[PDB]
Amino acid sequence: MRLATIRTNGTTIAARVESENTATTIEGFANVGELLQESNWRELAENAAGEAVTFENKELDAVVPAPKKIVCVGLNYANHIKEMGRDLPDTPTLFVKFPDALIGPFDDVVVPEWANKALDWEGEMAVIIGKRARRVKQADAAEYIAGYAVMNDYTTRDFQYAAPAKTPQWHQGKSLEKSAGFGPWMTTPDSFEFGGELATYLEGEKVQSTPTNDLVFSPEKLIEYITHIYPLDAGDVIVTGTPGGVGHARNPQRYIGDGETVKVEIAGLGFIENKTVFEL
Amino acid sequence: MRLATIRTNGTTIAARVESENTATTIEGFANVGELLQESNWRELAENAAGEAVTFENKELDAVVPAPKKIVCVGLNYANHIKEMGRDLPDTPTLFVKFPDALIGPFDDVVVPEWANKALDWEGEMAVIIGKRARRVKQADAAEYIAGYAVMNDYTTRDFQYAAPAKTPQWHQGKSLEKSAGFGPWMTTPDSFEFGGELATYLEGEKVQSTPTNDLVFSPEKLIEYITHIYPLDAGDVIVTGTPGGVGHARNPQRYIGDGETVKVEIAGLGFIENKTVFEL
Ligand SMILES: [Mn+2]
Ligand SMILES: [Mn+2]
Numbered sequence: 001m002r003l004a005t006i007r008t009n010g011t012t013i014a015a016r017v018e019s020e021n022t023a024t025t026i027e028g029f030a031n032v033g034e035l036l037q038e039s040n041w042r043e044l045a046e047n048a049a050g051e052a053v054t055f056e057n058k059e060l061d062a063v064v065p066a067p068k069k070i071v072c073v074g075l076n077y078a079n080h081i082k083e084m085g086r087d088l089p090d091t092p093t094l095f096v097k098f099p100d101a102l103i104g105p106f107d108d109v110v111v112p113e114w115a116n117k118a119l120d121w122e123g124e125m126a127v128i129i130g131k132r133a134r135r136v137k138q139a140d141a142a143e144y145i146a147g148y149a150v151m152n153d154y155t156t157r158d159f160q161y162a163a164p165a166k167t168p169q170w171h172q173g174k175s176l177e178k179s180a181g182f183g184p185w186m187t188t189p190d191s192f193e194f195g196g197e198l199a200t201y202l203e204g205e206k207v208q209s210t211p212t213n214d215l216v217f218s219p220e221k222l223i224e225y226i227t228h229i230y231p232l233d234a235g236d237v238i239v240t241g242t243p244g245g246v247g248h249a250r251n252p253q254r255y256i257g258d259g260e261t262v263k264v265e266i267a268g269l270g271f272i273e274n275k276t277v278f279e280l
Numbered sequence: 281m282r283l284a285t286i287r288t289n290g291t292t293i294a295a296r297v298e299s300e301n302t303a304t305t306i307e308g309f310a311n312v313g314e315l316l317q318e319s320n321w322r323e324l325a326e327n328a329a330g331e332a333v334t335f336e337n338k339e340l341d342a343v344v345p346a347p348k349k350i351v352c353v354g355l356n357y358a359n360h361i362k363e364m365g366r367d368l369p370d371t372p373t374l375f376v377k378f379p380d381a382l383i384g385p386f387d388d389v390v391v392p393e394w395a396n397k398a399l400d401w402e403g404e405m406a407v408i409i410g411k412r413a414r415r416v417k418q419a420d421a422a423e424y425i426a427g428y429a430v431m432n433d434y435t436t437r438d439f440q441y442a443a444p445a446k447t448p449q450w451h452q453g454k455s456l457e458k459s460a461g462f463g464p465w466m467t468t469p470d471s472f473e474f475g476g477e478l479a480t481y482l483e484g485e486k487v488q489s490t491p492t493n494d495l496v497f498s499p500e501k502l503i504e505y506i507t508h509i510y511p512l513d514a515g516d517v518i519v520t521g522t523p524g525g526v527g528h529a530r531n532p533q534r535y536i537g538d539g540e541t542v543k544v545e546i547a548g549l550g551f552i553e554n555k556t557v558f559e560l
Contacts, residue, residue, distance in 0.1 A: 069378060075444055091443040094452045096376035098349060100510040114508060135392075159509070163371040164354055167447045172374045177414075177510040228394060229439070230380040230457045 001045055003147070004185035005031040005061035006053060007104075012061050016048040017185050025050025032186055033064040033235035036130060036146055041234075042188075057273075062102035062182040063149045064128055069236040070097040071226055072153060072174060076216050076241030083249040092217045092225045097153070097239065098175045105150070105183030105272035112279045115156050115176055119256035119276060122153035122242035123200035123208045123264035127219045128186050129238070134231040141223035144232070147186040150264050150272050151239050152200075154179040157248045157255070181264070181272035182237075196267025198243055203260050207250075210243030212266060283325055283427070284465040285311040285341035286333060287384075292341055296328040297465050305330025312466055313344040313515035316410060316426055321514075322468075337553075342382040342462040343429050344408055349516040350377040351506055352404075352433055352454060356497055356521025357490045363524070372497050372505050377433070377519070378455045385430070385463030385552035389536075390559050395436050395456055399536035399556060402433035402522035403480035403488050403544035407499045408466050409518075414511040421500035424512070427466040430544050430552050431519050432480075434459040437528045437535070461544070461554040462517075476547025480525065483540055488525035492546060495520060 002017035003026075014035040015023035027050040029035040038044060074093030075081050081088055103109065111119060130146030153174065160173025195213030199206060217225070222238050232238070247254040256262065258278040265271035282297035283306075294315040295303035307330040309315040318324055354373025355361050361368055383389065391399065410426030433454065440453025480488035497505065502518050512518075527534040536542065538558040545551035 074449060086444055086446075089443055093443040093449050095449045096378075096451055098376075098510050112508070163369060163373045169354070169373055169375045169450060171376055171449075171451070172372075172509055175510055228392070229452055230378050230455055 001042070001188040001191055002185045003032045003035065003045055003063070004183065005063055005065055006055050006059055007061045008053065008055070008059060012065070013050065015053060016045050021054055023053045023055055024048035025053060031061065031065050033066050036064070036128070036235040039131065041130070041146070057106040057184070058104070060106060060183050060185070061104050063184070063186050064182070064235050064237060065099070065102055067099055067235050067237045068233055070099060070239060071237070072097050072239040073217065073222060073241040074170070077210055077214055077243035078216065079210060079244030080242055080246070083244050083246070089216065092222060094226065095170050095174060097180060100177045101175045101180045102182050103178050103180060103274065105181050106274070107181060108275045108277045109154060109179050110277045110279055115159070116278050118157035120155040120157050120247040121200050121202060121207065121256065121262045122155055122246060123198055124151050124153050124242050125198060125212050125240045125266055126151045126182065127222070127238040127240060129232045129234060129236045131234050132231060133223055133227045136223050136227045138220045138224040141220035142189070144223055145189055145219060147188040148192070148269055149183055149186050150266050150269055152181045152262055152264050152272060152274060153239055153242055181274040183272055184270040187269050192268030199265045200245065201263040202256070207247070208243055208245040214243065215240055281325060281468040281471055282465045283312045283315070283343070284463070285343055285345055286335045287339045287341055288333065293333070295333060296325055301334055303333050303335060304328040305333060311341065311345050313346050316344070316408070316514040321410070337386040338384070340385050340463050340465070342384055343464070343466050344462070344515050344517060345382060346379055347515050347517045348513050350379060350381070350519060351517070352377050352519040353497065353502065353521040356495055357523040358494050358496050360490065360523040361496065368496050372502060374506065375450045375454055377460060380457050381455045381460040382462050383458050383460060383554065385461050386554070387461060388555050388557045389434060389459055390557050392559050395439070396558050398437035398528070400435040400437050400527040401480050401482065401487065401536065401542045402435060402526060403478055404431050404433050404519045404522050405478065405492060405546055405549070406431045406462065407502070407518040407520060409512045409514060409516045411514050412511060413503055413507045416503050416507045418500045418504040421503035422469065424503055425469050425499060426514070427468045428472050428549055429463055429466050430546050430549055432461045432542055432544050432552060432554060433519055433522060434461070461552040463552055464550040467549050472548050478523065478546045481543040482536070488523050490523035
């Protein structure tokens with residue numbers, strides 16, 4: 001099952017994706033997040049009976065546009081850990097992206113002048129929570145996963161490493177409003193092969209390539225760790241980390257310039273494609 | 281003016297505080313956060329005409345129990361930073377506390393076994409946002425402040441510094457479920473003057489002390505800095521940082537034990553008083 005948030009001329013719906021450009025409206029929900037608040041969301045999706053829609057890629061909204069929590073994971077692929085001069089961790093690294101950072105999977109990333117100096121890509125697999133998860137053990141955690149999608153953890157590296165200078169808190173470089181493409185839609189775990197290639201492209205050149213089963217901490221381990229600190233609600237998002245090949249780590253160093261496009265693709269999940277636009 | 285969220289048996293109300301133990305119900309709102317979503321909240325509050333109530337300390341809820349954002353600041357007291365022999369920062373340190381962390385100003389902090397090893401206090405002022413703030417200049421920022429309150433940025437120091445070892449992301453030690461006392465009520469800026477003492481007490485012994493007008497980054501500066509990255513909505517909260525005297529920095533290191541109380545008082549705003557209780 002594939003669930004999308006679709007906006008036709010500014011108006012959003014929750015929709016069952018039927019093909020690359022057709023969907024069935026699921027009545028009574030503005031978006032997939034609202035749907036996931038219902039315990040019978042799978043049933044409602046299986047009985048979609050609203051307007052039939054034909055959609056362009058730019059009409060896809062952030063698949064869950066208003067999660068209460070987007071918990072981002074740092075340093076969760078060996079190759080990324082190595083390139084950033086770090087040790088293989090004993091403990092998951094967590095930091096927060098506010099939902100104001102989310103954009104549609106094909107939306108332009110409009111960057112203001114003060115934020116445009118060190119723009120970087122981080123292609124990541126997202127996990128979407130299907131019901132309230134509190135103090136959940138790893139062995140039970142898969143029950144709490146509604147499905148998966150793709151996100152760009154779109155980064156302002158100069159803000160990310162600003163403060164404090166010695167042990168910078170990354171949050172301010174990881175939550176630029178309207179920066180993080182999210183979709184194209186949520187795939188349920190019954191409907192793709194977990195573990196496939198995560199690939200990122202800048203202006204059509206492949207800059208990231210790693211299988212998702214090289215994750216150091218599994219979605220299940222991430223749910224156990226996070227949920228012994230605070231709960232995750234239906235519709236909340238875990239962003240499981242980026243593999244190697246980020247622009248900040250490259251020889252030579254490479255940042256996103258005006259008009260450049262970052263595509264992120266995960267085998268079985270589809271892709272997002274976001275053009276950076278420097279503000280007027 | 282002073283605004284409280286008060287639990288009344290199976291219900292909760294927004295109220296205008298009349299005395300330390302009385303208030304006037306503000307009709308049509310469950311909490312101060314809901315009230316702040318109205319354009320004319322200030323008027324609705326001044327003209328409160330609902331039922332007079334008598335409340336106990338333990339019936340106060342978190343003054344804004346469901347903010348969308350709690351943005352917490354790092355080092356922010358100038359004379360504290362200078363006496364550690366550090367430079368004043370030019371850029372704010374920001375990290376996120378999830379609203380699941382909030383409790384009432386007199387609530388017990390109930391802690392599970394895995395979190396109870398390095399419990400520490402941070403007495404701070406809270407700034408509550410009064411209307412939507414996006415790209416607000418420092419000169420204009422006072423207009424966006426609804427008022428002030430007190431928070432304990434209650435910390436699990438072992439979690440805070442866990443990962444990654446060399447530049448730890450504090451979030452996981454700053455967002456423990458049901459940890460952070462918040463209130464006792466919100467004071468409007470016309471009824472508060474900066475300069476008074478912020479003090480924290482452990483078991484009635486003073487452990488922190490600073491004048492409130494010794495900030496590196498004013499509420500106004502923080503609103504400008506934050507709102508050029510993402511918006512703040514009515515009812516969102518900036519927690520403006522803690523001075524010296526935290527348990528973790530002491531010799532010997534002094535963490536909160538089972539049954540111990542932390543009082544955080546700011547002259548002109550009131551105080552909060554939270555007893556730590558290890559869960560059985
Ligand atoms: Mn990332
Ligand atoms: Mn603090």
